[PDB]
Design a protein around this ligand. Structure first.
Ligand code: HEM
Length: 405
């Protein structure tokens, strides 16, 4: 379903990419997107799918667009428009200078100091989940570890009941990888029906959980509103539930297939940090955009006020101009260039938590279960959207090759 080409678009710039169902999906998600970087594709293209929108295909353009909030506003950051429209998360649907005050608070909740404090639980929970898995010689990594690990830590941070997971998780998924089961607004509403009561309850009787800190926070010398708090917490949930979860499955899927990569990490543990970076570049998975605040001419292409443009954070690091042999995983690259956690003022606050969750998992999984692989005849399927994912990850191993700790 291609929408009719708007008048201002040179037909030579058309490239019908469907962000929700790329063509090469079988080959893998990062691979399906990278077709945008082939020689036959202009740097800046227009796609008639999902209502028509621009796509910047190169690291350089993406970084520029992200730096430029004057022209490229966060107001309507999701494609399609109804989604970017219904989207009112804070600080994500705001531009500087307004953005800054909400950012500062959100930072209080997810920042470094919080990670440092939660470190022992992270380490505790991972060791526990793995040890539990170890003797089975088989899981569903996606359901068995990728989901529980990050979510339980979040539920811990937020002081929310583990029981709300399934419900919460469904709504989150609807937003990033729309099912067709519910629209963005319907989905936004449900997450909101959820948060409302809790926030109220934490304004009256504050805790030490993330929600309490948000609900009772100060912004521009005055108290945050209830609606504002609802809107921050809404974002925290989606990052908490939907990002780390998917990243881990790509990395684990990759590790299950590359014995040599596993080994390197086992023998030269000092490399874990460099490898985490490489994996964040290679298995990057977020694609959001911006809205043109006016007519603007960008790299010789005429953009019209109101046009949306996708600036796929995923693409910067896969771009050959940025990284030689981009599709190749090399833990010892001189420079790992990516924008996996974004670029500009909206640079991801949860990056610290995310990095801690990844490193712990690698170090801990490798220690106990150094040798594993994908279940014979399982066919791994990726999914595309704002946040790309893995559907299921059937792994098998010989219990006799594991090590208890
Ligand atoms: C795999 C890990 C993650 C990746 C790849 C990721 C990616 C991103 C991206 C690309 C952005 C900027 C979007 C934009 O400019 O439109 C962002 C922003 C944000 N992320 Fe992360 N995210 C991850 C994990 C997390 C976690 C664990 C949290 C905290 C629970 C989180 C919280 C946030 C927040 C609060 C923002 C907004 C910052 C602002 O608007 O100034 N993210 N993330």
């Amino acid at each position: 379903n291609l929408a009719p080409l708007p008048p201002h678009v040179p037909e030579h710039l058309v490239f019908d990419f469907d962000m929700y169902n790329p063509s090469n999906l079988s080959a893998g998600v990062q691979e399906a997107w990278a077709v945008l970087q082939e020689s036959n594709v202009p740097d800046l293209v227009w796609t008639r799918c999902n209502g028509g929108h621009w796509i910047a295909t190169r690291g350089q353009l993406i970084r520029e667009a992200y730096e430029d909030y004057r022209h490229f506003s966060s107001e309507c950051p999701f494609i399609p428009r109804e989604a970017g429209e219904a989207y009112d998360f804070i600080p994500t649907s705001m531009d500087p200078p307004e953005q800054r005050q909400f950012r500062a608070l959100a930072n209080q909740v997810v920042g470094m100091p919080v990670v440092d404090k939660l470190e022992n639980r992270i380490q505790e929970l991972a060791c526990s989940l793995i040890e539990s898995l170890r003797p089975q010689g088989q899981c569903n990594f996606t359901e068995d570890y990728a989901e529980p690990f990050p979510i339980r830590i979040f539920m811990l941070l937020a002081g929310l009941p583990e029981e709300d997971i399934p419900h919460l998780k469904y709504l989150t998924d609807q937003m990033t990888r729309p099912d067709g089961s519910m629209t963005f607004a319907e989905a936004k509403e449900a997450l909101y029906d959820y948060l409302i009561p809790i926030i109220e309850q934490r304004r009256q009787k504050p805790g030490t959980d993330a929600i309490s800190i948000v609900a009772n926070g100060q912004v521009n010398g005055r108290p945050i509103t209830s609606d504002e708090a609802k809107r921050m917490c809404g974002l925290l949930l989606v990052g908490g539930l939907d990002t780390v979860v998917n990243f881990l499955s790509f990395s684990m899927e990759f590790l299950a297939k590359s014995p040599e990569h596993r080994q390197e990490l086992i023998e030269r543990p000092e490399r874990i940090p460099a490898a985490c970076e490489e994996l964040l570049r290679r298995f990057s998975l977020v694609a959001d955009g911006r809205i043109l605040t006016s007519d603007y001419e960008f790299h010789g292409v005429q953009l019209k006020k109101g046009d949306q443009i996708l600036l796929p954070q995923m693409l910067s690091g896969l771009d050959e101009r940025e990284n030689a042999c981009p599709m190749h995983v090399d833990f010892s690259r001189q420079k790992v260039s990516h924008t996996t956690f974004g670029h500009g003022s909206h640079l991801c606050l949860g990056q610290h938590l995310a990095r801690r969750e990844i490193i712990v998992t690698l170090k801990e999984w490798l220690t106990r279960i150094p040798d594993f692989s994908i279940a014979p005849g399982a066919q791994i399927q990726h999914k595309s959207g704002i946040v790309s994912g893995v559907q299921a990850l059937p792994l098998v191993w010989d219990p006799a090759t594991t090590k208890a700790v």
